[PDB]
Amino acid sequence: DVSFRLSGADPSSYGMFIKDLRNALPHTEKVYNIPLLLPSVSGAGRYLLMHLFNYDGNTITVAVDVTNVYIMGYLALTTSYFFNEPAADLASQYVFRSARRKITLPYSGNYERLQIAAGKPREKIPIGLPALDTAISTLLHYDSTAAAGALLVLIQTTAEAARFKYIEQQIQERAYRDEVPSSATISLENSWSGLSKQIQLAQGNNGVFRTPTVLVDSKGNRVQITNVTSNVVTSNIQLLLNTKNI
Numbered sequence: 001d002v003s004f005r006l007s008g009a010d011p012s013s014y015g016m017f018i019k020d021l022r023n024a025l026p027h028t029e030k031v032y033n034i035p036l037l038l039p040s041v042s043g044a045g046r047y048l049l050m051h052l053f054n055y056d057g058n059t060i061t062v063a064v065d066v067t068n069v070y071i072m073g074y075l076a077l078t079t080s081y082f083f084n085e086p087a088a089d090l091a092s093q094y095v096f097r098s099a100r101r102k103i104t105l106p107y108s109g110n111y112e113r114l115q116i117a118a119g120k121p122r123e124k125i126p127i128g129l130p131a132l133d134t135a136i137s138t139l140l141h142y143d144s145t146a147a148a149g150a151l152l153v154l155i156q157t158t159a160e161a162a163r164f165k166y167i168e169q170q171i172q173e174r175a176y177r178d179e180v181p182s183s184a185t186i187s188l189e190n191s192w193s194g195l196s197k198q199i200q201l202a203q204g205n206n207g208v209f210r211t212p213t214v215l216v217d218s219k220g221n222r223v224q225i226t227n228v229t230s231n232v233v234t235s236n237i238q239l240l241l242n243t244k245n246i
């Protein structure tokens, strides 16, 4: 398991949590020095438990699929909550079984569906450590519309930060003041599968992408990523989605 406490949190403690999260994901090899997530894990070992504590010390446990860093569901007191999707239903066979009741959320976990449920795109939803405190608090008691927004915050401040050093740093800058994600942040989130694929394909193609990946940079300008020498590959991305799962 991994844990993060918002009470007393600062950029350093958040950084330690994201390091722990990354290190909790298993891999047998690295591709261009980046951990390659496994094609498959069997049984309960497929799921990592994240214990998150709001400023008041109340807690939820979030279940994360270790092959893709997808959030499956979470436990709040004696109630479990899972996304309305087959992968999450499968997860419910293994985690939070001791919960008194299980609620299936009225949406799947993908960004497009969560934004519809929340009533806004995540371009307009502030993120940061304060927002994460709010998200945890919202998830403690069921409210599906509120939870969609909370989950958009949760996914970005945990999973996406684990995937990209740039996103981790963006949240560290928002340790005491929320701000909507940069255009680059959104770009990286949307390109993780594509980037993971091209980096794996680059092995066997002299480090060259079979298909270029278009990203927005820290400046708001649209760059094109063609090979493993790019900063996105050498410094930014921290985990690769296995091509088996793409």
Ligand SMILES: Nc1ccn([C@@H]2O[C@H](CO)[C@@H](O)[C@H]2O)c(=O)n1
Residues within 6 Å of the ligand: 069, 070, 071, 072, 083, 085, 088, 108, 109, 110, 111, 112, 155, 159, 189, 192
């Ligand atoms: N069950 C799920 C499904 C998806 N996701 C996140 O949303 C993105 C897909 O739009 C994915 O890239 C992933 O980050 C999630 O957190 N949990």
Ligand SMILES: *[C@@H]1O[C@H](CO)[C@@H](O)[C@H](O)[C@H]1NC(C)=O
Residues within 6 Å of the ligand: 224, 225, 226, 227, 228, 229, 230, 231
């Ligand atoms: C590889 O990517 C770098 C950085 O984006 C770029 O400068 C260079 O032109 C690319 N090299 C090749 C051979 O495409």
